[PDB]
Structure 1
Amino acid sequence: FVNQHLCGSHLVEALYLVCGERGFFYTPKA
């Protein structure tokens, strides 16, 4: 589910599944 084009909510969803309880930071303009 990670080896594709991931945009918007699809990308945040991927970060969520991958990073787990560590959490993540989403910075689309950085």
Structure 2
Amino acid sequence: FVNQHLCGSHLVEALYLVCGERGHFYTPKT
């Protein structure tokens, strides 16, 4: 990841990297 200014499509892209990829990527057992 990069800490920077983010807006519009760049902000939607960041939300995919932090949260959206983790929506379909695997989650192991606790």
Cα offset, 1:15, TM superposition? 0.3
- More RCO (CA 8 Å, sep 6+): 2
Aligned residues: 30
Aligned-partner SS, 1:5: coil
Q: Taking structure 1 as reference, are residues 9 and 28 closer, same or farther at Cα in structure 2, changes over 3 Å only?
A: farther
What's the CA shift for 1:14?
Answer: 0.3
Query: What TM-score, normalized to structure 1?
Result: 0.51
C-alpha distance 17-7 of structure 1, shift in aligned 2 (>3 A): same
Change (3 A) 1:26 1:8: farther
Deviates more, 1:6-15 or 1:17-26: 17-26
Q: Match of 1:29?
A: 29
